[PDB]
Amino acid sequence: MHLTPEEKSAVTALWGKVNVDEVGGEALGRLLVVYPETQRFFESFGDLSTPDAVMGNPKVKAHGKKVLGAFSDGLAHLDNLKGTFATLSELHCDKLHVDPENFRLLGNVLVCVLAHHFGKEFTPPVQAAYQKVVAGVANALAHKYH
Amino acid sequence: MHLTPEEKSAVTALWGKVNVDEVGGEALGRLLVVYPETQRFFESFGDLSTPDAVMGNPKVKAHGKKVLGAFSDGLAHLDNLKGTFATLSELHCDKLHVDPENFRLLGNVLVCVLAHHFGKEFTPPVQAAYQKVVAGVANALAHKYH
Amino acid sequence: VLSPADKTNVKAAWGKVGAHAGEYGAEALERMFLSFPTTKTYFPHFDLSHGSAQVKGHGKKVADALTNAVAHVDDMPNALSALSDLHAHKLRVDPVNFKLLSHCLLVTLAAHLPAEFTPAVHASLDKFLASVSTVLTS
Amino acid sequence: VLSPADKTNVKAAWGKVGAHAGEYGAEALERMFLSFPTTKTYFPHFDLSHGSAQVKGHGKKVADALTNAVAHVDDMPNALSALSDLHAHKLRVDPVNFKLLSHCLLVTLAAHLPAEFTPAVHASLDKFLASVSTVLTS
Ligand code: HEM
Ligand code: HEM
Ligand code: HEM
Ligand code: HEM
Helix, strand or coil, X not given: CCCCHHHHHHHHHHHCCCCHHHHHHHHHHHHHHHCHXXXXXXXXXXXXXXXXXXXXXXXXXXXXXXXXXHXXXXXXXXXXXXXXXXXXXXXXXXXXXXXXXXXXXXXXXXHHHHHHHHHHHCCHHHHHHHHHHHXXXXXXXXXXXX | CCCCHHHHHHHHHHHCCCCHHHHHHHHHHHHHHXXXXXXXXXXXXXXXXXXXXXXXXXXXXXXXXXXXHHHHHHHCCCCCHHHHCHHHHHHHHHHCCCCCHHHHHHHHHHHHHXXXXXXXXCCHHHHHHHHHHHHHHHHHHHCCCC | CCCHHHHHHXXXXXXXXXXXXXXXXXXXXXXXXHHCHHHHHHCCCCCCCCCCHHXXXXXXXXXHXXXXXXXXXXXXXXHCHHHHHHHHHHHCCCCHHHHHHHHHHHHHHHHXXXXXXXXXXXXXXXXXXXXXXXXXXX | CCCHHHHHHHHHHHHHHHHHHHHHHHHHHHHHHHHCHHHHHHCCCCCCCCCXXXXXXXXXXXXXXXXXXXXXXXXXXXXXXHHHHHHHHHCCCCCHHHHHHHHHHHHHHXXXXXXXXXXXXXXXXXXXXXXHHHHHHC
């Protein structure tokens, strides 16, 4: 992961203003509404039939916070993404059977949500930096698939 | 390049039996026939109007051999494909303006050409080892796009 | 497919874009070039610097094409015909690149339309951009 | 899209496959599973070991559906509808995987039908597999 010093600054700077609880909720929620194929992994979450059922679902909000906290771990270890996500990778592969293409969908829904929340502040150069990070996290989540 | 030693051994052994003149002309020839969109980068090679025109085109055959030459060079460099293909990467990016998505197309046509020439000896395991080589080469060529 | 609800969402969202469409198209292209550098290979004869007028000029054309697609939401394949011949047969733009531009438009719209970019509308726009991409690539 | 000459190339090659279709579908599966391990995530209830019986049995099913597609090359959407609802709405297979299976099928054919696998025929089969994928993912 080729992250220059400026990109890292920009990224980190940015993350420090993120309310993780909420952004996670929104991110996971929009993933299930915009790309309904990813609902097949969460049948135990109950009602997912409309946008309001999804976005306000308490199990969706709790899971989203969980995903985003892990995402948080990654940003604290940008120079060792593979090590940090190694056990999560094996989990998503061996136990959950998630096609890694789904990791890219989520990565991009997150970029959209950061842009939604920060508007102006989310400039092109800042988006470019976050796109490297989400690609990095998706590649690291994918590495132990076998 | 995560290749098991029995994988490297599998790749090397088959490669030593490869007739570069034939395979190289066939791989490049099939790229342009099977994926005509790639014809836009070789207007200078001449008449590419029909399959028969493409497969007998002496410029197509000669350039194929050069491309396999570069691929042999990576095979003997599997530990540093990045360094091995850097200049070639900059050329494909700054001088010829080739979308790196096209590298995959050539890699797969090449795998289809090996299977066509080796038949039963191109077993699933050998194929898998070569898919890894071919991805790594694609990635190496893309690395310096800026 | 675009459902009725989807069409409504799209009309209402592009509606609110109004006169700022050209600038959004322009921002969307800059976002794409910076975040996904391989896309620049299709524009080697452009000046791709920040503020470039060639880029502003091009952003405007992309947005007009999208406006027209919305105006003819029930016959997009025929309304976008000329643009499909250009992209798929003259330029030969690889389909993945459409996904990258679409994503960049969504980011632009989100960054500028806080109150209208709800989950439902986001799903609708995404579907519309996919439909535009399928047409342009076919 | 599929031309008459493509249709022609595909019937002949496929008719050469003859009674090996089954054997070929299974081989193409095993090539896919070893070369592209992420595809195994859609088959967690299968024994995926070498030469195992679900894979073989499954190989027959894939190869027969292609037999049927060829026979109905002119109206695939209709002939395949049921497989389309299965892969698109029930299984929700991400499209990327279709390109991976198609490649493996091409590799297999080329490995077994050397004389029939000419460039023109490689070109038509590749357009054929892409059309089937399009039907099965829309
Ligand atoms: C940034 C990417 C992702 C990260 C960091 C992440 C993180 C996590 C974490 C921390 C868990 C809890 C693990 C455990 O239960 O011990 C989890 C579980 C899960 N993940 Fe992911 N995940 C990601 C993407 C996805 C995606 C894209 C999918 C599918 C679309 C997915 C499907 C699941 C499922 C189904 C569970 C278990 C849910 C349950 O408790 O029933 N994950 N993920
Ligand atoms: C991924 C495997 C590929 C490799 C290893 C490769 C490598 C090369 C090499 C060694 C040369 C000759 C450099 C020289 O003589 O100075 C070359 C030239 C070139 N390559 Fe590639 N290339 C690859 C794929 C492609 C792709 C897929 C295309 C376009 C579809 C492409 C487009 C070109 C063009 C237009 C030239 C100049 C040819 C000419 O002299 O007109 N390359 N490349
Ligand atoms: C939303 C999808 C897209 C739409 C609606 C669109 C629309 C347009 C329009 C209106 C033109 C100008 C037509 C003219 O001046 O005659 C154009 C040209 C062009 N487009 Fe697209 N485009 C899209 C996606 C893409 C993508 C993904 C690429 C490549 C990454 C691309 C590359 C080009 C190029 C190279 C030209 C010619 C530019 C020039 O030489 O002036 N477009 N497009
Ligand atoms: C040429 C493309 C393909 C064709 C023609 C095809 C055909 C079929 C057929 C005939 C079935 C059995 C349906 C039945 O029982 O009535 C099936 C099932 C299935 N396909 Fe495909 N398929 C294709 C591609 C794919 C790919 C790309 C994937 C994902 C890697 C996939 C995953 C599955 C799975 C998981 C099943 C269910 C297996 C089971 O539950 O027993 N298929 N397909």
